[PDB]
C-alpha cells in the first residue's frame with residue numbers, strides 16, 4: 663500500500679503521551695517518527711483506513727506530516743513526523759519559556775496557514791484546539807489530528823464550538839473559524855481553559871446569551887479584534903482563513 667507501513671520497519675524507543683498511546687521511534691533504524699497505537703475497539707478502522715488515503719495527499723509545512731498507517735494489525739498504527747516539543751497546550755503552560763507576544767502571534771500564524779490550506783482543499787478539521795496542535799524542535803506549531811474525530815466510536819468540544827453547532831450540529835468551515843478564534847485565545851492566555859470558571863453546560867448557555875471570551879492581557883487590541891471576529895453570531899459574517907491570515911500578517915508588521 664502507498665499508505666502502508668510495515669510495522670517490522672518500526673523501532674519503539676520512548677513513550678510520548680482515550681485514542682491510545684504515542685511513542686517515539688525510528689523507521690528503518692534511521693528516521694525519527696511518532697507512533698500512535700490505536701486502542702483496540704476505539705475507532706472506526708475501515709472508514710479511517712479509506713480516509714487515510716485522502717489524508718496522505720494533504721501536504722503542508724504547518725500540517726503534521728502523516729507517513730502512513732499499519733493496517734492488517736490490532737491495533738492500527740498511525741505514523742507521523744516527530745514533534746519534539748509535544749502538544750501546544752502543554753508548551754504554552756510552561757511558564758519558563760517567557761514568550762514574547764511576537765512568538766505567540768507566530769504560533770497563531772503557523773496554525774492559520776495550516777487551516778488556510780485545509781480550507782483550500784475543502785477539508786474540515788472539526789476539533790481544532792491547542793490540545794490537537796504540536797510543536798517541533800524549532801518551535802514551529804503544526805496542526806494535528808485533522809478530521810480524526812469522525813472515526814472515534816460529555817467529552818464533546820463544547821468550549822470550541824459556535825452556537826449553530828451547540829444548538830443544531832451544523833458543522834462548516836465557519837465552525838473551524840470559531841474554534842480558531844478560541845485557539846488564539848488559548849495561546850494569548852498561555853494555555854488557560856476557555857471559560858475557565860464555567861462547566862460545559864454553563865458555557866453553552868452563556869454563548870447563546872451572547873457572552874464571549876474576554877481579551878487576554880497579552881493580546882493587543884488589534885489581536886483581540888482578530889480572535890473576536892471569529893465569534894460572530896452569524897456564521898456567514900465570520901472571516902475565512904485567508905482573511906484571518908492577512909489580518910495576522912498586518913499585525914505582525916505593525917507590532918514588529
Ligand SMILES: C=CC(=O)N[C@H]1CCN(c2ccc(C(N)=O)c(Oc3ccc(Oc4ccccc4)cc3)n2)C1
Nearest residue numbers: 678679684696698742743744745749751793807808810
Ligand atoms: C495536549 C494533549 C496531549 O498530551 N496530547 C498527546 C497525544 C498526542 N501526543 C503526541 C505527542 C507527540 C507527537 C509527535 N508527532 O511527535 C504525536 O504525534 C501524533 C499525533 C497524532 C497522530 O494521529 C493523527 C491523526 C490524524 C492526523 C494526524 C495525526 C499521530 C501522531 N502525538 C501528545
